[PDB]
């Protein structure tokens, strides 16, 4: 028969792309603009996430003969700025945020406080329609949002990101990874892809892998989380 043991691409699980995006936008409009909202009930592990991210990122900023710069970072799917506040603003002179949900960007101005004055651009845009400026960012940080893009949109978005990197710049993807295949969450309208699927998409964007690390110390019941450094 034609029905495979499992799916391995978004075209196998997404019935209608327009509805996939519109349902996701509606979902996020209804979420409280809080850390626990950003983390789907896992606000209590925000520090575990941030501290591991900092260690992951610092190697690129502090070590080697070709250090990644600290002039400008872009936080993708930034929400209210959980990551911008504790990871990026303390490390970069300037940060831009991009998110589809304007109310989160509005909340960010309050959430980020005084240090938020160093957030330059608040881009309200879906990643699928967003073009980061060429030769502009030292670090493009993409976390807990890749499941909201189709495979074609994710591949193209990553390709646009590559052109946006400054010399020695990197893209970091940190996100849920499925044990096997591609799994649809029809409640928030997103997918979770396995490591192989994500590797294929990274390759198709013309990106090279610099580091790949599984997040330790997370809740037992959740999908595994991986960080990929790319350029």
């Amino acid at each position: 028969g034609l029905v495979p043991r499992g799916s391995h691409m978004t075209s196998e699980v997404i019935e209608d792309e327009k509805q996939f995006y519109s349902k996701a936008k509606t979902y996020w409009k209804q979420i409280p603009p809080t850390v626990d909202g950003m983390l789907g009930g896992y606000g209590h592990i925000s520090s575990i996430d941030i501290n591991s991210s900092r260690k992951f990122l610092q190697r690129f900023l502090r070590e080697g003969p070709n250090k990644t710069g600290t002039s400008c970072a872009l936080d993708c799917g930034a929400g209210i700025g959980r990551i911008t506040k504790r990871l990026l603003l303390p490390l970069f002179r300037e940060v831009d945020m991009v998110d589809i949900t304007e109310d989160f960007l509005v909340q960010a101005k309050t959430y980020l406080g005084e240090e938020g004055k160093r957030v330059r651009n608040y881009f309200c845009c879906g990643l699928q329609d967003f073009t980061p400026e060429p030769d502009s960012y030292d670090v493009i940080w993409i976390q807990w949002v890749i499941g909201h893009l189709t495979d074609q949109h994710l591949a193209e978005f990553l390709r646009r990101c590559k052109g946006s990197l400054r010399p020695n710049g990197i893209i970091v993807i940190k996100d849920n990874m499925a044990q096997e295949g591609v799994i649809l969450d029809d409640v928030d309208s997103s997918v979770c892809r396995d490591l192989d699927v994500v590797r294929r998409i990274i390759c198709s964007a013309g990106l090279s892998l610099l580091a790949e690390e599984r997040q330790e110390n997370l809740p037992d019941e959740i999908y595994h989380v991986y960080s990929f450094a790319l350029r």
Binding site: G40, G41, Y42, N176, A178, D185, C192, L218, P219, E221
Partner: peptide, 8 residues
């Protein structure tokens, strides 16, 4: 967000 992987 981080989320349950569901049933084993």
């Amino acid at each position: 967000x981080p989320k349950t992987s569901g049933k084993a």
